[PDB]
């Protein structure tokens, strides 16, 4: 009689997120090809978007999805990414059907669930690149000199995906990727 079961129509997330899509439309430049699909700030709206969008393993080669916090564009040029970098995970051709979709959904849940605790503010978003040569998934962070935040993020993320502990993943600064002719950290 006292303890009435309570329920909620919406369950807000701690941050608002935006899903971006990149298509290699050869009539446009790189930046013009990076477009905002939609924003969400609740569990219900995340699942409504995820269940009704094309899987990463079904995208054409050269396409990308990105989930970034509201106000952060998924590019090195953004103020919140300029001094940052990314933890990069590389997949071979065999892993497209077996790992890509599982890894990306686990990455999305990692982000929206704030799995990095006190280093949550260092997280900017994640990107999945679908490529014929090999797929890639990355988590983008705001400051490549914050070693404690970067390595905590990397360690929690690598363990979450269930990656074998013997093969390392690297963290590349965006300033180094933008000038490539090199990893700052490994985990
Ligand atoms: C993420 N990123 C990708 N590029 C361009 O995309 C190219 C390839 O970057 P990629 O698509 O991340 O890797 P890929 O080698 O598997 O294709 C880079 O050499 C840049 O020309 C980018 N170009 C700009 N301006 N800004 C970015 O944030 C950015």
UniProtKB/Swiss-Prot annotation:
Q: How does it assemble?
A: eIF4F is a multi-subunit complex, the composition of which varies with external and internal environmental conditions. It is composed of at least EIF4A, EIF4E and EIF4G1/EIF4G3. EIF4E is also known to interact with other partners. Interacts with EIF4ENIF1/4E-T; promotes recruitment to P-bodies and import into the nucleus. (Microbial infection) Interacts with Lassa virus Z protein.
A GO biological-process term: cellular response to dexamethasone stimulus
Which disease does its entry mention?
Autism 19: A complex multifactorial, pervasive developmental disorder characterized by impairments in reciprocal social interaction and communication, restricted and stereotyped patterns of interests and activities, and the presence of developmental abnormalities by 3 years of age. Most individuals with autism also manifest moderate intellectual disability.
Please explain the role this protein plays, according to its UniProt record: Acts in the cytoplasm to initiate and regulate protein synthesis and is required in the nucleus for export of a subset of mRNAs from the nucleus to the cytoplasm which promotes processes such as RNA capping, processing and splicing. Component of the protein complex eIF4F, which is involved in the recognition of the mRNA cap, ATP-dependent unwinding of 5'-terminal secondary structure and recruitment of mRNA to the ribosome.
Post-translationally, this protein is described as follows, namely:
Phosphorylation increases the ability of the protein to bind to mRNA caps and to form the eIF4F complex. Phosphorylation also enhances its mRNA transport function.
Give the subcellular location. Answer: Cytoplasm, P-body; Cytoplasm; Cytoplasm, Stress granule; Nucleus
Q: Name one GO molecular function term.
A: RNA cap binding
Something else known: The antiviral drug ribavirin relocalizes nuclear EIF4E to the cytoplasm and reduces the elevated EIF4E levels found in acute myeloid leukemia patients, suggesting its potential use as a therapeutic agent. Ribavirin suppresses EIF4E-mediated oncogenic transformation by binding to EIF4E at the functional site used by the m7G mRNA cap and competing with the mRNA cap for binding to EIF4E which leads to relocalization of the majority of EIF4E to the cytoplasm and inhibition of nucleocytoplasmic mRNA transport.
User: Which parts of this chain are annotated as the region EIF4EBP1/2/3 binding?
Assistant: 11-14, 47-51, 106-113
**Listed PANTHER family:** EUKARYOTIC TRANSLATION INITIATION FACTOR 4E, EUKARYOTIC TRANSLATION INITIATION FACTOR 4E RELATED
Q: Where is this site: (Microbial infection) Interaction with potato virus Y VPg?
A: 133
Impact after mutating residue 93 to A: Higher affinity for EIF4G1
Q: Looking at the UniProt record for this protein, which Gene Ontology cellular component terms does it annotate, in alphabetical order?
A: chromatoid body; cytoplasm; cytoplasmic ribonucleoprotein granule; cytoplasmic stress granule; cytosol; eukaryotic translation initiation factor 4F complex; extracellular exosome; glutamatergic synapse
Family per record: Belongs to the eukaryotic initiation factor 4E family.
Per UniProt, where does mRNA bind? 30-31, 76-77, 131-136, 179-181
Instruction: Indicate the impact reported for residue 30 to A.
Output: Impairs mRNA nuclear export. Reduces affinity for ribavirin
Q: Which UniProt keywords apply?
A: Acetylation, Autism, Autism spectrum disorder, Chromosomal rearrangement, Cytoplasm, Host-virus interaction, Initiation factor, mRNA transport, Nucleus, Phosphoprotein, Protein biosynthesis, RNA-binding, Translation regulation, Transport
Supply the name of the protein.
Eukaryotic translation initiation factor 4E
Pfam families for the chain: IF4E (PF01652)
- Tell me the organism: Homo sapiens (Human)
């Amino acid at each position: 009689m006292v303890a009435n079961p309570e329920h909620y129509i919406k369950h807000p997330l701690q941050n608002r997120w935006a899903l971006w899509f990149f298509k290699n439309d050869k009539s446009k430049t790189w930046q013009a090809n990076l477009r905002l699909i939609s924003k969400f700030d609740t569990v219900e709206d995340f699942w409504a978007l995820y269940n009704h969008i094309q899987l990463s393993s079904n995208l054409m080669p050269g396409c990308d999805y990105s989930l970034f916090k509201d106000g952060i564009e998924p590019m090195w040029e953004d103020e919140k990414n300029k001094r940052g970098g990314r933890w990069l995970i590389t997949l071979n051709k065999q892993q497209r059907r077996s790992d890509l979709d599982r890894f990306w959904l686990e990455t999305l849940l990692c982000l929206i669930g704030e799995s990095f605790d006190d280093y949550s503010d260092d997280v900017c978003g994640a990107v999945v690149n679908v490529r014929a040569k090999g797929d890639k998934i990355a988590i983008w962070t705001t400051e490549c000199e914050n070693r404690e935040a970067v390595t905590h993020i990397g360690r929690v993320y690598k363990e979450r995906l269930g990656l074998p502990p013997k093969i390392v993943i690297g963290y590349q600064s965006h300033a180094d990727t933008a000038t490539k002719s090199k990893n700052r950290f490994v985990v």
